[PDB]
Design a protein around this ligand. Sequence first.
Ligand SMILES: Nc1ncnc2c1ncn2[C@@H]1O[C@H](COP(=O)(O)OP(=O)(O)OC[C@H]2O[C@H](O)[C@H](O)[C@@H]2O)[C@@H](O)[C@H]1O
Ligand SMILES: Nc1ncnc2c1ncn2[C@@H]1O[C@H](COP(=O)(O)OP(=O)(O)OC[C@H]2O[C@H](O)[C@H](O)[C@@H]2O)[C@@H](O)[C@H]1O
Ligand SMILES: Nc1ncnc2c1ncn2[C@@H]1O[C@H](COP(=O)(O)OP(=O)(O)OP(O)(O)=S)[C@@H](O)[C@H]1O
Lengths: 83, 185, 398, 398
Amino acid sequence: LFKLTEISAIGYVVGLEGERIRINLHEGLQGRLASHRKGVSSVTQPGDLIGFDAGNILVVARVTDMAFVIPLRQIIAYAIGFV
Amino acid sequence: FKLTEISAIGYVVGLEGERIRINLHEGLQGRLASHRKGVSSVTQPGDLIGFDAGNILVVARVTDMAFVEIPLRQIIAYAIGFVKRELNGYVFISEDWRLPALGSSAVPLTSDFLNIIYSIDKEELPKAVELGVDSRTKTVKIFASVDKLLSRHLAVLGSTGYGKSNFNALLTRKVSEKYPNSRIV
Amino acid sequence: SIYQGGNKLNEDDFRSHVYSLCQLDNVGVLLGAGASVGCGGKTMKDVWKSFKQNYPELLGALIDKYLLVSQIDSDNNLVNVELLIDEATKFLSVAKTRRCEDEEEEFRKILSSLYKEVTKAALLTGEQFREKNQGKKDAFKYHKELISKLISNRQPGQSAPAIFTTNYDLALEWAAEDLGIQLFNGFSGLHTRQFYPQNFDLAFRNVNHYHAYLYKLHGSLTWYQNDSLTVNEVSASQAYDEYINDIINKDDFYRGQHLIYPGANKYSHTIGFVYGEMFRRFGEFISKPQTALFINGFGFGDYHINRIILGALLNPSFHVVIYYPELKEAITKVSKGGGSEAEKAIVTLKNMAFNQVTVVGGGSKAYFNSFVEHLPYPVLFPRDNIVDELVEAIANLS
Amino acid sequence: SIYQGGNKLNEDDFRSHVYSLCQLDNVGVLLGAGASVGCGGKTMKDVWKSFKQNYPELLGALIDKYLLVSQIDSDNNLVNVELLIDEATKFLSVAKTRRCEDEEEEFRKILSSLYKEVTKAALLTGEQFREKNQGKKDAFKYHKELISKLISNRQPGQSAPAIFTTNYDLALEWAAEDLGIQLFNGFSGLHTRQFYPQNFDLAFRNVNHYHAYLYKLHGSLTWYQNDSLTVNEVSASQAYDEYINDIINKDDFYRGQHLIYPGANKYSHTIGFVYGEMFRRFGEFISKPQTALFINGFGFGDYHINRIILGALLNPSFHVVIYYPELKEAITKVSKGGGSEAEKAIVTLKNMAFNQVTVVGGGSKAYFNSFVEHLPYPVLFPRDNIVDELVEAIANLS
Ligand SMILES: Nc1ncnc2c1ncn2[C@@H]1O[C@H](COP(=O)(O)OP(=O)(O)OC[C@H]2O[C@H](O)[C@H](O)[C@@H]2O)[C@@H](O)[C@H]1O
Ligand SMILES: Nc1ncnc2c1ncn2[C@@H]1O[C@H](COP(=O)(O)OP(=O)(O)OC[C@H]2O[C@H](O)[C@H](O)[C@@H]2O)[C@@H](O)[C@H]1O
Ligand SMILES: Nc1ncnc2c1ncn2[C@@H]1O[C@H](COP(=O)(O)OP(=O)(O)OP(O)(O)=S)[C@@H](O)[C@H]1O
């Protein structure tokens, strides 16, 4: 019954090229939707904010692109700050 | 039992900034469609299409066409608004930050949605005036409100021999035929 | 009114929470008896009133001689009937076995009186029960929208909807036959139906087809046992003749270990097998990730459902919505250290700091018709009857 | 009072070193007997400072007759209690062998009185040692945080933490059975539990952050040898009933080759095999690249662990952190021709041109409950109790 967190994930990092970040998504609607103790939250289109764990900080980023490569889906983002 | 009475022509395969990328189906499914109101097509870089999103309908304008390299054809578009219901009808709102999701299906537009994209409010309908018809399709009539149009100043511009004196007589006579207590000089 | 998280909420944010909940992996609805009052049904208070108004001479034995009922609950009309019928089946089973010829007759005319009253209320149409196309009428107009809106708001690749209910009437099947949708209920065949508990795991696909699942928890008006090992299903015209007519009309007519409504003969090992495989599936469904549940018509007087709901709320991805018309008239009884267990249970929920819970309690605004109007249609759905105007000319041709 | 590289530091520049240390490939922890005085335990002075008081008639034989302890040490309370028990256990076997009937009954009393002061102190509770759910209490509150932080600060692909200790008590198992964590310790089975020394090479995985490792260098209260030749583990309730309620409340010691604490019977080829395999793993974890080790609770009065640590600074990728709350007095005493071996040992490395070493003092600033708070929680970790208000609402449904 030990759990490391309560909000679930959307994908995993696979590349850094300078300022860019590259993300591979999970299969299904588990890569778009989510649900938690507070409500429902989504990530759909360019112009949206996303977050990454880094231990003692949370990195914040903005989406720019999205596309196919069922098939696989990718994302591109840039960094804004941290909490 | 049916979910729709209008078929699709393609599906979204990309989102790169403000652009949209669409792959079409093979055959005349990609160019034509028949429904209870007539026949509709999407064939060159000036047309309007729409995307289904459940609660709203996104409206977009075409910009390009090509074969990628039977072969496969692509399309590219931009967004100009969305449609929705109000009480038992619909309404058009112009704002360009929304986009459709991957995998969503593309569908053409009909003379029931064009007549909502090119219409005026209900508050102004009993004070309207007819001017003409749309050029590309010619299934939709154009109305304008006397208040908005004339409470302020108006400008008419044009070269010689192209139809500029018919417009002013049309307008000035249709104002009188509807409001016979007017004053025109 | 509307409370979420112990804090009030407004209509246009409620109508957008609903539309975000109707788009998750798993979606379901649990209905009760109030939901069939606009179609011709009634609640349990109205049943107990009629019983105690028409058979006042058996209302003494049950209380002062066998102790099956209590006087305070009889007076305040708070009795459970599907729980009083099983004990009276047990008594008769014991008396038959030990050969008490005098006590076997009294429990044979108590059950007839109970069954007549509880069966008359569930026909919804009277002598037109044994007829065809009974979902074309007007009373079944809001039962169609529910199904249409639950199907239309899915996407390709997603699961299909589930409808649990405690009624034993025939109002959700009539309405789907007039709409062209297949319901899975666990039965197969035409000339001999019988229960296969492993076709709740099937589906359809096309080659060159819309369905849903239905779980009845207390039985149905068309199920019966005849041999030693099998329950059978049957149509309404075929049941009216066999057994549903003599029950209404004749005076004393009772066959034991034959009928499968409502939660009656669970002491056998072929009938309880039907009641258990529904609660098992309810439990399984209410324990998956990304799950949403709507409740309507249910009065919250079942201890075995209370705790399922309470304990499925430890998982962060389960959301529930509740409709209760009498919330105000009950918040007071328990501030004054009174009230019944249902009132206490519902106020315990209303007064907790969880955003996975929502209660709607504004009287006639917490009814079945308003629930169905809080749900959305899509823009492209064809919503008008263009075809009936064309189906009359084909008839006129003659 | 924080010395790195021979010179001083400040709080922030050290709290930023800790965080960078916990992110290395291999991470470990070594604990001692001073870590369990905040839960009901006792250090090793207080044990002799009470044996002396309660049994003086035996304190003369050990000094004037058999020469097992010295006068100045006994007066300054600086005796090692494990080696005394080992030697007294080895004195009895010779007599039992060559049939001396006086020296055989003279040592049973000594051993019965020695095995009665360390047991009574390793019971952290008392008569609630045999009961269930003991890690739910308040004394075991920082032991939980230690494990939580050691587990939640790792990444996928990185190995799992290790834990070494010198206690023979049950404070980290009680405190892990509650969180829901599994500890490997070498034993397997339930009805016949046995020591297999390869279970330290295993790990879990799912098929649809679960485990850690524990090494006990001096044994435990639940380990024993039967009339067979094999070691067996049992639970606390079973041990209380077999061989722990007689030790205290009686005078019985005739099973002289039976117990496996606190490091006594190392002359049997079957009981030493289990002690060796723990040091053989310490000295193999402490010899890897990119390793970090935190020490706490341990007085450096052991020759072999020091001879093992000192020889690991010769690799440039091993780092140490030490907590010693009596550092001022030691510097004082060894400034002018004095001090014991422990103080000399720690002061020896307190003065070094080695950035691998870091020493911490300040009395109550070097204690266990401050060691813990120096460790970081992640930023996305659940802390607010948001599930406990809901487990009593399910109990109110009596
Ligand atoms: N038109 C209406 N629309 C919606 N709700 C209504 C309406 N009229 C009344 N109600 C509400 O409908 C509710 C009627 O509650 P009851 O019929 O007693 O309960 P049940 O149907 O679950 O009885 C079966 C259970 O009885 C055993 O306990 C077993 O556990 C069974 O599960 C009231 O709250 C009304 O406010
Ligand atoms: N609350 C506290 N928190 C942290 N440390 C404390 C606390 N209280 C005291 N201390 C420190 O805890 C220390 C207590 O040291 P001792 O218990 O004698 O030594 P050991 O536990 O290694 O004994 C086992 C050894 O005995 C055999 O020789 C074997 O070699 C074993 O290794 C003091 O330095 C205190 O400053
Ligand atoms: N909808 C129309 N379709 C085709 N021809 C049109 C239409 N409307 C007007 N015309 C023709 O346009 C011709 C010339 O328009 P004019 O009235 O001469 O415009 P104009 O020359 O700009 O006006 P001025 O400045 O007074 S000469 C007329 O002969 C009309 O028949």
